[PDB]
C-alpha cells in the first residue's frame, strides 16, 4: 500500500535565553528515521532508524548543512512575524511546519504538502494543486505575496515531485525489512470494579506495526462507539505501537461484551472477552 515521508519542524524563540530552539524530525510511515536538534551538545543530522546506517557520511554532512540553513531561516522568520503581528520582543513564539509527500505502492506521487502554523494556529499552506497557497490571515497574506513573486510554489513542487519522492523510494528500499513489515497485535482484556454494580472492561492491543488499527466493543453484534473511552494509538519505545479502548458494563454481564481488533497483521480480526 501507500507510504509517506514527513518532516515535522519547529522553531521556538526564547527571549533572554539566546537563539531559538530549532528541530527537524523526519518520519517514513509512522517510524522516526532522522532528527536535528539545535540544543544538542553538537548539533548534527542523526539517524533515528537502524537502516539509515546505509547512508554515507556525505548524507549526514549535507543534511546537517541544510538543517543549519533552515535554522537560520526560521530565526529570521520569527523576527519577521513579530513585526507582521506587531508583537513585543519579550515573548516566546513558535513556528511549526509539516512538509512531505505520499506515494502509492508503485512509487508514484499521490499527494504533496507543506503547512505552517504560528503560535498553534494555521498560517499558510500549499494547496493540493501544488501551485497556490492558502493564507489563514493577513500576516500570512504578506508571505503569500512574497512566495508568489519569487516562484516559491514551483520550487516546492519540484522538491515534492522530485527529491521528496525519490528519497522516499530509496528509504523504503533501504529500510524495507523494517518499513514493509507487519507486526500483529496481541490483545487482552482487563477488568476493574466501579461503584454502582458496574465494571470497566479494557481491551488492549500490543506490539503492532503499522500504527493503523481499529478496536471496538460489541454487545449483541452492535458497536458501542458512543460509550467507549480510548487513547490515541501510541508508540511503545521500540518502533511498535499500542492502544486501548474501554467500556463500562453491568456487573454480571461482562461475558456478553466482545472486543474486536482489526489490523493489517490480523488476517481474521481478533474477538476476545474478559476471562476470569
Amino acid at each position: 500500500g501507500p507510504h509517506s515521508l514527513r518532516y515535522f519542524v519547529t522553531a521556538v524563540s526564547r527571549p533572554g535565553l539566546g537563539e531559538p530552539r530549532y528541530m527537524e524530525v523526519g518520519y517514513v510511515d509512522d517510524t522516526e528515521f532522522v532528527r536535528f536538534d539545535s540544543d544538542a551538545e553538537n548539533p548534527r543530522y542523526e539517524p533515528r532508524a537502524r537502516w539509515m546506517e546505509q547512508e554515507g557520511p556525505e548524507y549526514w554532512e549535507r543534511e546537517t548543512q541544510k538543517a543549519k540553513g533552515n535554522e537560520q531561516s526560521f530565526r529570521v522568520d520569527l523576527r519577521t512575524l513579530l513585526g507582521y503581528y506587531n508583537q513585543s520582543k519579550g515573548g516566546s513564539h513558535t513556528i511549526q511546519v509539516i512538509s512531505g509527500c505520499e506515494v502509492g505502492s508503485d512509487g508514484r506521487l499521490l499527494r504533496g504538502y507543506q503547512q505552517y502554523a504560528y503560535d498553534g494556529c494555521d498560517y499558510i499552506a500549499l494547496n493540493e494543486d501544488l501551485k497556490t497557497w492558502t493564507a489563514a490571515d493577513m500576516a500570512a497574506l504578506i508571505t503569500k505575496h512574497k512566495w508568489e513573486q519569487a516562484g516559491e510554489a514551483e520550487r516546492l513542487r519540484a522538491y515534492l515531485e522530485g527529491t521528496c519522492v525519490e528519497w522516499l523510494r530509496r528509504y523504503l528500499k533501504n529500510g524495507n525489512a523494517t518499513l514493509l513489515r507487519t507486526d500483529s497485535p496481541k490483545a487482552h482484556v482487563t477488568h476493574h470494579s466501579r461503584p454502582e454494580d458496574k465494571v470497566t472492561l479494557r481491551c488492549w492491543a500490543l506490539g503492532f506495526y503499522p500504527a493503523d488499527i481499529t478496536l471496538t466493543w460489541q454487545l449483541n453484534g452492535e458497536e458501542l462507539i458512543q460509550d467507549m473511552e480510548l487513547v490515541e494509538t501510541r508508540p511503545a519505545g521500540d518502533g511498535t505501537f499500542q492502544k486501548w479502548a474501554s467500556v463500562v458494563v453491568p456487573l454480571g454481564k461482562e461475558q456478553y461484551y466482545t472486543c474486536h481488533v482489526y489490523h493489517q497483521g490480523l488476517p481474521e480480526p481478533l474477538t476476545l472477552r474478559w476471562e476470569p
Binding site: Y7, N70, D77, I95, I124, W147, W167
Partner: peptide, 8 residues
Amino acid sequence: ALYNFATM
C-alpha cells in the same frame, strides 16, 4: 530529503 525552506 528535507526541503530548503524559504523565508516568510
